[PDB]
Structure 1
C-alpha cells in the first residue's frame, strides 16, 4: 500500500482541484500538495509552481484550508485536526494547536474552507454541511453555531473547496469543483458563476 508522492501538475493542461486558495499580503495563492502558484490580485496566469516549503517549511505535505487574519496580517493554515499560524515565514510560538483550541468541537477532524468576511471582519470556518463564526478580536467562537450552510447561506453548496473575499472590491468567491460562485457582500445575491480555469488561472 505505501505509495510515492504526486508528480508536478500543469495548471491549464489538466483539471486541478486545489486544496486551498487565499490572498496573502496582496497575492492570491493556489495550493495543491506541496506546490503553490501565485498571481498578483487578478484573473491572469499564475507564476509557479513553487514549493510551499520555500515560504512555510513547517507545514505538512498537504493543507486543507488557508486564510489570512486581517487584524495582524497573519496566515492561518489548517491540516488534519491541527492549525499553524505564521507572521510571514515565521511560525508563531505554540503552534500547531489542535482545532479545539479554536473552539471547534472534538468531532471535527478536517476543515473544508475558511476566510475572513470583510463585511464584519468575522472569520467563517466551513466543514461539510455546517459552518462556524470565529471572532478574531475576542479570539473566540461566537454563540449560536454551528449552523448549516444550506440554511444560512444563499445557494452556496456543501463541501466547498475554498472561499475568498478579495480586498479589492466587496465580492466573495466560493469555489467548488471546476466552478466558483460570486456573491455580493452587501446583497448576498449570487451575481454570477464561472470557470476557475478561465476566470482565475487565465488559461
Structure 2
C-alpha cells in the first residue's frame, strides 16, 4: 500500500531494530522515525545500503554481536559492521528450506528462549539457535500460540524491555508476556500524527 499516513490503508513488509532505533521497510523505500523524529521520511534503501537487495521479506537484528539480517527471495545477506558481506548470494536451502519456503512474513528472536521463529503465511516455525537444529517442519499456528495478534502477521520486531511489537494490516498490537494480554491498540500512523 501507500505510505499515506493521513489515510487508513497502509501496510508494511518487514521491520527491524538497531540499538534504540526502529527502521521500517517499504518495498524499496524505508521509513525513519524514532529517538528524535517528529516526522517520518520515505527514502530509498539502495540509497544507503549498497550491497543490499530490495523487497526485504523479514528483517530481524541480533542484540548480541551487534549484527543484522536481511531476507529477500531464496537468499539472505549477512550485515557485518554496518555492511552486508559482499558477494554473499547465500540461499536458505543451505539449511532451512523445508518444503517450499522462500518468502517469509516476519522473524524475531526471543532472548528468554534463544530461539528464532518465523511465519509462513499461516505457519509457526521455530529454529533452535543454541542447538543449531531447526525443528521438523513444525506446522504450528501463530494465532494459536498467541491469541490476540492474529493468524497473519506482517512485520514483527522486539523493541522494548519485555514486550513484543506485532502488526498486520494497519494496526500495531503489542503483546505482554506478563499475562499474555495486549494493552495497546494503535495504528501504524498513530505516532506520525494522523
Pair in the same fold by TM > 0.5: yes
Structure-2 change in CA distance of 1:186 and 1:145 (3 Å)? farther
1:161, distance to aligned residue in structure 2 (A): 0.8
Determine the C-alpha separation between the residues in 2 that align with 1:130 and 1:63: 19
Instruction: Confirm whether residue 23 of structure 1 aligns to residue 14 of structure 2.
Output: no
* 2:188 corresponds to: 196
* 1:86 corresponds to: 79
Pairing 1:111-150 to 2, within 5 Å after superposition: 111-142=104-135, 145-150=138-143
Instruction: Confirm whether residue 48 of structure 1 aligns to residue 2 of structure 2.
Output: no
Q: In the alignment, is the contact (CA less than 8 A) between 1:71 and 1:137 conserved in 2?
A: no
Structure-2 change in CA distance of 1:55 and 1:138 (3 Å)? farther
Instruction: Specify which structure has the higher proportion of strand.
Output: 1
* 1:74 corresponds to: 67
Instruction: Specify which structure has the higher proportion of helix.
Output: 1
Determine the C-alpha separation between the residues in 1 that align with 2:129 and 2:35: 24
Residue deviations 1:153-202 (CA, integer Å, cap 9, x gap): 22332231111221x3211011110112210033222223221111x434
Q: In the alignment, is the contact (CA less than 8 A) between 2:10 and 2:188 conserved in 1?
A: no
Relative to the length of structure 2, the TM-score reads 0.84
Q: In the alignment, is the contact (CA less than 8 A) between 2:14 and 2:59 conserved in 1?
A: yes
Determine the C-alpha separation between the residues in 2 that align with 1:19 and 1:184: 23
Aligned residue pairs: how many? 193
Relative to the length of structure 1, the TM-score reads 0.80
1:113, distance to aligned residue in structure 2 (A): 0.7
Moved more, 33-42 or 62-71: 33-42
Q: In the alignment, is the contact (CA less than 8 A) between 1:70 and 1:121 conserved in 2?
A: no
Q: In the alignment, is the contact (CA less than 8 A) between 1:21 and 1:163 conserved in 2?
A: yes
Q: In the alignment, is the contact (CA less than 8 A) between 1:71 and 1:136 conserved in 2?
A: no
Determine the C-alpha separation between the residues in 2 that align with 1:82 and 1:108: 11
Determine the C-alpha separation between the residues in 2 that align with 1:195 and 1:11: 13
